[PDB]
Amino acid sequence: VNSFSGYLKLTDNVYIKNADIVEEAKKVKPTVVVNAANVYLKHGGGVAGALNKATNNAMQVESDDYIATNGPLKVGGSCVLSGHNLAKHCLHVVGPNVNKGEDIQLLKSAYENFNQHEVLLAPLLSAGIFGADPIHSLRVCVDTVRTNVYLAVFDKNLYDKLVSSFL
């Protein structure tokens, strides 16, 4: 039993809710919140921009030190950093950005990072400003993640379509 509330159950381990991931994380304080990161951990917009703003830019400061030490992530890769005031940990995961021409096949590799964590609060990878089809992202999530994932979908209209079209 966990403290996630109000989700629809899609499978044994995948759940979904119309919610602002920032407001969700502040309420639940999950062990792991997933950020929709880029390889430079530059959290300018989208989910990343919103999560960073909620940390008062502390996420960005920590991320800049991480990059200065380690260099960029790989597309499909991840790193674990602090969750600041939102969660214990933030798993920064880089899905392919279609608007940069990145290979959508890497979306499965991106979701594989979730399997290293027993429970996660997460957005749909490569959705929104990363330009992939969110129905596809949900399919890849369900077919790749085996740990317990609670998906927050900000847009109510998109949330309704994801449920009604789910196979």
Rounded CA separation 153/145 (Å)? 17
* Nearest residue relative to Cl ion (C-beta): 128
| For ligand A1BBO, the closer CB: 1 or 57 | 57
Q: Tell which residue, 108, 113, 92, 107, has the closest CA to residue 37.
A: 92
Question: How many residues are present in the chain?
Answer: 167
Stretch of 65-73, 79-87, 105-113, 127-135 contacting ligand A1BBO, by CB under 6 A: 127-135
Q: Is 139 in the site for ligand A1BBO (CB under 6 A)?
A: no
Q: Which ranges of the chain would DSSP assign to H, the alpha helix?
A: 21-28, 46-54, 58-70, 106-112, 134-144, 156-164
Q: Is 128 in the site for Cl ion (CB under 5 A)?
A: yes
* Nearest residue relative to ligand A1BBO (C-beta): 127
- Point out which residues bind ligand A1BBO (CB under 6 A): 20-22, 46-47, 50, 123-124, 127-128, 134, 152-155, 158
